[PDB]
Amino acid sequence: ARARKGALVQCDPSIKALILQIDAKMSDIVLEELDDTHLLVNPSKVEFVKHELNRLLSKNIYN
Amino acid sequence: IANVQCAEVWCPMTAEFYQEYLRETARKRMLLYIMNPTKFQACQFLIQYHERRGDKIIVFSDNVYALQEYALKMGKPFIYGSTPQQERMNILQNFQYNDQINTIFLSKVGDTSIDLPEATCLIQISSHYGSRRQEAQRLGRILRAKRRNDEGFNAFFYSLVSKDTQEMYYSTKRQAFLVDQGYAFKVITHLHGMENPNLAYASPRERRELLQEVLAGIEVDADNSVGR
Amino acid sequence: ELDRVITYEGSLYSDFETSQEYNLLSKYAQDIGVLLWKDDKKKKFFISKEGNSQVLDFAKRK
């Protein structure tokens, strides 16, 4: 009966957890948790999330 | 002489393998990007493609766990440190002279030294820190022109790389070094027509079987074979 | 794996009154190849931005 625009993000559970951590810090990122591997995210924040994930993973001093 | 096409073949990590790759912090994680089933399938396809051309193929694995998982599954002979002198010579003589045996697997014991045999195709399952120079040397020692003087390339080097892993960092480096050494070099992201072959690991369950086996391994299993 | 994170623009459908209505639109969306995700237990699904107008049009014709 209702539709809303957004960006669907499909990712592994560990990445889902990381995006939730990003949201908790920055807010206004995650619109809905959909399932263990899917989120609805603010479309204007998708590139931010992708860049931040890359930084979190690639720049980790314990790599 | 030999005209060599060099290629890196970039293979996605199966999501189940990528999950564990992230979670595990010890060198054990090297085994997850080495045994990644997409990389195995690429290796299997390349052996098929080249054996159809009656090319001779050496597959190099620096890791014994991987050497055996690949060779035994693909039913090809393998040579590594503990292979006896007699069995090693049987295999090399078979590779060299028996038309039914044109692909063999060799570990770090290959370079150097016993006498590396000649081949038209060299496939490296792994890439690591940090000898770009030992790679080019081995490429040079092994690769001979398939006796196709008309053809643009008569010998082939492939290095299989798992995407989203530390393996990729070694790539911008290898490409620069090989071209600077005078080689034609490209990146392959999709092997033309892998979907026309019957390759292993087509099901999630078969991949999970391998995943369990890799997870059971130890940090020792993920070290390169050392030899003096 | 980060290399396996995929994102898609589109529309999330929800608030279905009946299981039959939800599954009708879900099936039509799958038939025309525009359904990206669904969860029967929540009666929600996500349609590609490209496919959204056709799904809306089908809904309004029932």
UniProtKB/Swiss-Prot annotation, chain A:
Keywords: DNA damage, DNA repair, Nucleus, Transcription, Transcription regulation. It is found in: Nucleus. InterPro entries: TFB5-like_sf, TFIIH_TTDA/Tfb5. It comes from the Eukaryota. One of its GO terms (biological process) is transcription initiation at RNA polymerase II promoter. Its main location: nucleus. Signal peptide: none annotated. GO terms for cellular component: cytosol; nucleus; transcription factor TFIIH core complex; transcription factor TFIIH holo complex. Belongs to the TFB5 family. Component of the general transcription and DNA repair factor IIH (TFIIH) core complex, which is involved in general and transcription-coupled nucleotide excision repair (NER) of damaged DNA and, when complexed to TFIIK, in RNA transcription by RNA polymerase II. In NER, TFIIH acts by opening DNA around the lesion to allow the excision of the damaged oligonucleotide and its replacement by a new DNA fragment. In transcription, TFIIH has an essential role in transcription initiation. Component of the 7-subunit TFIIH core complex composed of XPB/SSL2, XPD/RAD3, SSL1, TFB1, TFB2, TFB4 and TFB5, which is active in NER. The core complex associates with the 3-subunit CTD-kinase module TFIIK composed of CCL1, KIN28 and TFB3 to form the 10-subunit holoenzyme (holo-TFIIH) active in transcription. An additionnal subunit, TFB6, plays a role in the dissociation of the SSL2 helicase from TFIIH after transcription initiation. Interacts with TFB2. This is General transcription and DNA repair factor IIH subunit TFB5. The gene is TFB5.
From Swiss-Prot, chain B:
Belongs to the helicase family. RAD25/XPB subfamily. It is found in: Nucleus. The chain holds residues 549 to 785 of 843 of the full protein. Disruption phenotype: Essential, it cannot be deleted; epistasis studies suggest it is involved in damaged DNA excision repair. Present with 825 molecules/cell in log phase SD medium. The modification Phosphoserine is found at residue 203. Residues 41-195 form the Helicase C-terminal domain. ATP-dependent DNA translocase. Component of the general transcription and DNA repair factor IIH (TFIIH) core complex. When complexed to CDK-activating kinase (CAK), involved in RNA transcription by RNA polymerase II. May have 3'-5' helicase activity alone, the TFIIH core however has no 3'-5' helicase activity. Also involved in transcription-coupled nucleotide excision repair (NER) of damaged DNA. In NER, TFIIH acts by opening DNA around the lesion to allow the excision of the damaged oligonucleotide and its replacement by a new DNA fragment. Component of the 7-subunit TFIIH core complex composed of XPB/SSL2, XPD/RAD3, SSL1, TFB1, TFB2, TFB4 and TFB5, which is active in NER. The core complex associates with the 3-subunit CTD-kinase module TFIIK composed of CCL1, KIN28 and TFB3 to form the 10-subunit holoenzyme (holo-TFIIH) active in transcription. An additionnal subunit, TFB6, plays a role in the dissociation of the SSL2 helicase from TFIIH after transcription initiation. Interacts directly with TFB6. This is General transcription and DNA repair factor IIH helicase/translocase subunit XPB/SSL2. The gene is SSL2.
UniProtKB/Swiss-Prot annotation, chain C:
It comes from the Eukaryota. It is found in: Nucleus. Component of the general transcription and DNA repair factor IIH (TFIIH) core complex, which is involved in general and transcription-coupled nucleotide excision repair (NER) of damaged DNA and, when complexed to TFIIK, in RNA transcription by RNA polymerase II. In NER, TFIIH acts by opening DNA around the lesion to allow the excision of the damaged oligonucleotide and its replacement by a new DNA fragment. In transcription, TFIIH has an essential role in transcription initiation. Present with 8900 molecules/cell in log phase SD medium. Component of the 7-subunit TFIIH core complex composed of XPB/SSL2, XPD/RAD3, SSL1, TFB1, TFB2, TFB4 and TFB5, which is active in NER. The core complex associates with the 3-subunit CTD-kinase module TFIIK composed of CCL1, KIN28 and TFB3 to form the 10-subunit holoenzyme (holo-TFIIH) active in transcription. An additionnal subunit, TFB6, plays a role in the dissociation of the SSL2 helicase from TFIIH after transcription initiation. Interacts with TFB5. Belongs to the TFB2 family. This is General transcription and DNA repair factor IIH subunit TFB2. It comes from Saccharomyces cerevisiae (strain ATCC 204508 / S288c) (Baker's yeast). The chain holds residues 447 to 508 of 513 of the full protein.
